[PDB]
Ligand binder design. Structure first.
Ligand code: NAD
Ligand code: NAD
Lengths: 652, 660
């Protein structure tokens, strides 16, 4: 929970302190190994003690020293609230002055929900170390500030640390977030571990530190769109019904490949060596069927293809086994191929060789590392050679940004990559993540927004360009099936892709519905940082740009600054979202739609910039796919006037 | 140049193109040949990148032309596009063909940074630091001026390390421009990638004020050194008056050359030794040096007299600073009270430091003839210099490191720098000054009239005198230092290019001066709007483990949260334009620095924006530095929290080390 129990959120650091504590009902983060020197370890304790009354220092010093020895990190477990279930509550349940701050508090608690976060009690949402706060004192103080702040104040968050409330104005963001911002030369993984333990920084991933993670439905949608575009670009079909997709991995992100294929109406085959990962997804419903022998698999796949059934079929075994079996098959069975093994970690648990069993590999990778790498590289060569033979017979393969072709290249090996071949063109058009959360926590509101988003995209597609109408159709297919796929976890949220006008129109319609009373609560707009403008990442988000600027971070910095004075309720700039610490600069936003004309104006203005910034950059950096879309925007939007690149053809 | 000739600023890329640059204007100095060592592919891409700015119809000729520029200069400046129909300089704001006076002001600031009188390598778009650039090429300049001429107050120009991405819709309170320079994906921010991407036209190094269009000349260094001497005087001598006090230092080079004037403004006796007659006699001719001595014996007799008569005088010694130090050891009299060193010991073997054993000409010779022997003599001279300093220190002389890596390089030479036994001004002094909120307050009179600058000097003077009353003991001292400066600033004739001025002021100081300026613009006492700005050497704008955040020992000095937070916070609080740079001060990849400019036009909007933005731009870093463990920041933070409505920050509780 009620509004009574949530009054504690305004307390901050309780006086006197709560009793000391480990709750093993949830998964816990692995022990951190910062390897702090005696000097840094003393500083780490001192830094942590900054949050507490001096009268508590002596006992907390031993307590925090204990946490470092046992967990490798000072989480301050005794400050984690236990009098209520950590989750998103109705926005009207929060004892806050500002509805905007209340919305943020709701978003934060969702990131710390046991059902949502990876390591909830360690304040880790996803990605192993994609954190929300460095410790539970920062949580308590931030929540206190958010309950206390007005709309003429702005909360400054230094990698989890609430620096304090500073004067601003209603149109200003209520919070500015920076996670892991480093002086460029000191952004090593070693300095992360060190400074994370010393309480001077944290890794916020993308939506972990920016308070807008909503579960794995983003990956399901993402893979769905990827499959659809792959079908059009590589096969030439606007419909994947009857088409077979062979892929691998049922892990964190790759586990979504099953539902994605089904939603596309395709027969999707996912190979997984790990029975744990495979039967998990099977039990979850993300995997419809399971096959053990490859011969029975192909018979099943043949019958599925001919009957045009939307089905996900897991194969308990190595993906190389399936690939090499198809080579011995004189008949065409699989039309599309990919791979989502973790070849970014090829020799230590990410890739399992065909020569060994799952258990034998798990043993050899640490027992005989040299032998394991040799078998992996050999297995990689056998996989590519099989794909080559099948590609020559009509099959179309693409790399799913998992460094499969890169590692295969580094052993001996022509195929496109999802980031550089299909997503880059989608970003260039302006289509990217459009995420929203109904702050009423009512499923009815989510149902309505689903229908509103559907109705909006339908009318937009009728007058959209031929390129856009294909992207819009992809997201229409998704939003109509999204609800029945039961992907909602924690907060009532949804995700799709939309270009500039798509996001603007849906937002305005959402905002009208909040004002009309159809929506019983305001709606927070947000997105992943896997977007057109938000992230500079030479290995991913900007890997398709070949002017050389993929190593620069001008765009990401420009974008977050541009969002901040255009009406975002809060913004964030992170280090190494996606590809990893030091390898990316990623930023995002959240904007609360409360039905006011202000919110509509903010949304229209901000979303315009958040899309056309990257669209213009990507065009300037060599992407020609959205060049016409850019020029239409320029003609359509008053006040928009950009430098139009005249790209010389490399041959000429 | 009249308002008619400046209409060419609205053109952007001329159609048809102006004639190709046949020769080269030798009336100005030119940047050294760049060496990116581009691969065949990167070189091809560099040319393709440059061609993006031009009609495809001109690509045939420009390709070879830009290729030629690569082979000759190591960079594609696009010399063809450099305007030659007018003198590049700041012109009165009314001369510019802009819809927006805010944009017109930015154009004025831009052209000042490119003034032959101001810029180091003007035709290479470099203002200072050797490669601290304004734009990557002249196309970026032309388009930027085009956008600024045409833009309204409802648009914002996004500048990507020189590249004007375009005008995007915003609102009157939004920045008219957002500037980034050298922003990199962290693991790729190497000096090699800078050289590579600079040539490829993907990035540039903007230093601090070079890329942010707000460099105003060498009066920043003069003021900076004035403040340093004053604080060194108070902290190391315990005196508020340096009259009769003697400062010994070295170097009359680029920045070190301001030590002469700084000492005089402090009313002290400053002795600056310099082996290079080029630097020394230049300073003499510039009036930055009042006197010149040749032998050390006649020097010390002169210094004695000046000290006894409390004469404010700068005295240059043509010779080695070591020669003076060792002579002081033999002199029984107390002559010098304060000692420092500003030789370039960050490059002690490449001409930054000249040993005592050799003459200036002898040193230049074996600098390339016998590097091994030279390095031995340098390290030997370094040990002797410290040995002499140690003896004078034992006799009451107070020495400090000027952040030139003197003590660091001496330590590597095996000099007795331990019991460092001498404090570094950056970590010992400036950190506390920043923590109080005091830092660069800079303004430009857009009328380009000296009369306006005189008035702003008087307004600033009167303002600081009034703030003396209700200020803390610590802040009263800093205000006094800037009062001594501002009353003498005009007569020192430090203005080059635009009518500009710089001083240090804390939160309320910057706010009140801004408000008084804005009142004067509205009343008509000032003939034109005033652009507020600052160097990035400030309290909140820069994360730099070697400098601006070097006195923070909580471990966070490696982080860049504060700098990123600051520029964002300024951006939605009414800044006219903001900048976030990579590598300001210390160098590429070694710092993250941000800045702002804010135009005062007399309106309620400007007054409101100034009050709010300046509050954040100061108190952000004050609060951080307090949190990171600075005691001065802690005290200033608490006073602000009590004074400012809407200000509520996290107060750090410091544990006793005995508990650890
Ligand atoms: N949207 C996306 O899905 C996306 C986006 C960007 C990058 N990626 C990349 O995709 C990869 C997968 O991501 P994840 O989170 O699912 O990783 P993960 O480690 O959780 O899952 C990989 C799975 O593949 C299985 N596997 C390994 N070798 C196999 C083999 N030979 N045959 C069958 N199964 C095998 C592993 O057992 C594991 O379950 C990563 O490399 C990631 O960088 C994915
Ligand atoms: N505000 C400041 O002044 C400031 C700020 C930051 C850093 N620094 C540091 O200060 C140093 C000086 O900067 P600069 O721009 O003046 O450089 P500079 O190279 O132009 O000046 C150094 C001068 O010292 C002279 N010199 C060298 N060895 C000498 C010796 N033994 N005796 C006498 N003279 C000698 C050189 O001939 C030269 O003229 C640099 O190391 C710089 O990093 C200064």
């Amino acid at each position: 929970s009620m509004k009574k129990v949530l009054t504690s959120l305004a307390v901050g650091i309780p006086s006197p302190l709560p009793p000391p504590c480990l709750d093993e009902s949830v998964p816990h983060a692995p022990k951190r190994t910062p390897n702090l020197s005696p000097a840094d370890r003393r500083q780490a304790i001192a830094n942590a003690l900054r949050y507490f009354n001096t009268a508590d220092h002596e006992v907390l010093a031993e307590e925090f020293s204990r946490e470092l020895d046992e967990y490798g990190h000072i989480y301050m477990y005794r400050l984690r609230p236990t009098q209520y279930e950590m989750r998103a509550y109705p926005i009207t349940d929060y004892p806050a002055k500002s509805k905007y701050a209340a919305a943020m508090m709701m978003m934060i608690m969702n990131n710390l929900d046991n059902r949502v976060a990876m390591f909830p009690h360690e304040l880790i949402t996803y990605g192993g170390n994609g954190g929300v706060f460095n410790n539970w004192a920062q949580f308590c103080l931030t929540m206190k500030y958010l309950c206390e702040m007005t709309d003429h104040q702005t909360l400054a968050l230094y990698s989890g640390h609430p620096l304090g409330l500073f004067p601003s104005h209603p149109d200003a963001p209520r919070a500015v977030i920076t996670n892991g911002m480093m002086v460029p030369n000191y952004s090593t993984r070693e300095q992360y571990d060190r400074l994370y333990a010393m309480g001077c920084t944290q890794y916020g991933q993308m939506t972990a530190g920016s308070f807008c993670y909503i579960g794995p439905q983003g990956i399901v949608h993402g893979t769905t769109i990827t499959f659809r575009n792959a079908g059009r670009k590589y096969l030439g079909v606007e419909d994947l019904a009857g088409k077979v997709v062979l892929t691998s991995g049922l892990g964190g992100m790759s586990g979504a490949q099953g539902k994605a294929g089904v939603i596309c109406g395709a027969v999707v085959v996912v190979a997984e060596v790990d029975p744990n990962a495979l039967y998990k997804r099977k039990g979850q419903g993300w995997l419809m069927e399971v096959e053990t022998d490859v011969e029975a698999l192909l018979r099943r796949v043949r019958a599925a293809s001919a009957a045009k059934e939307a089905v996900s079929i897991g194969f308990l075994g190595n993906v190389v086994t399936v690939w090499e079996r198809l080579v011995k098959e004189k008949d065409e069975i699989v039309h599309l191929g990919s791979d989502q093994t973790s070849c970014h970690n090829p020799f230590n648990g990410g890739y399992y060789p065909v020569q060994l069993t799952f258990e034998e590999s798990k043993k050899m990778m640490v027992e005989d590392p040299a032998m394991f790498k040799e078998l992996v590289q050999e297995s990689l060569r056998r996989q590519v050679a099989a794909i080559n033979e099948m590609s020559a017979r009509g099959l179309r393969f693409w790399d799913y940004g998992n460094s499969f072709l890169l590692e295969a290249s580094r052993a001996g090996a022509r195929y496109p990559s999802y980031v550089q071949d299909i997503m880059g063109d989608i970003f260039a058009l302006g289509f990217g993540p459009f995420r929203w959360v109904c702050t009423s926590c009512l499923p009815e509101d989510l149902e309505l927004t689903d229908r509103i988003a559907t109705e909006t995209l339908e009318k937009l597609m009728k007058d959209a360009s031929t390129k856009s109408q294909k992207q819009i159709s992809d997201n229409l297919l998704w939003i109509k099936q999204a609800g029945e796929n039961k992907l909602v976890v924690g907060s009532q949220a949804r995700i799709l892709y939309a270009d500039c006008e798509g996001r603007q129109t849906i937002a305005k319609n959402f905002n009208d519905a909040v004002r009309d009373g159809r929506l019983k609560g305001p709606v927070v707009l947000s997105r992943d940082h896997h977007d057109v403008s938000g992230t500079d990442s030479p290995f991913r988000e900007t890997s398709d740009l070949y002017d050389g600027s993929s190593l620069t971070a001008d765009m990401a910095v420009q974008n977050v600054i541009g969002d901040a004075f255009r009406g975002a309720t809060w913004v964030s700039l992170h280090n190494g979202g996606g590809t990893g610490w030091g390898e990316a600069t990623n930023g995002g936003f959240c904007l609360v739609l409360d039905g006011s004309a202000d919110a509509e104006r903010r949304a229209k203005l901000m979303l315009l910039w958040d899309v056309l910034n990257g669209v213009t950059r990507r065009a300037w950096s060599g992407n020609a796919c959205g060049h016409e879309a850019m020029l239409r925007a320029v003609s359509r939007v008053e006040g928009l006037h950009v430098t139009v690149p005249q790209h010389v053809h490399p041959d000429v």
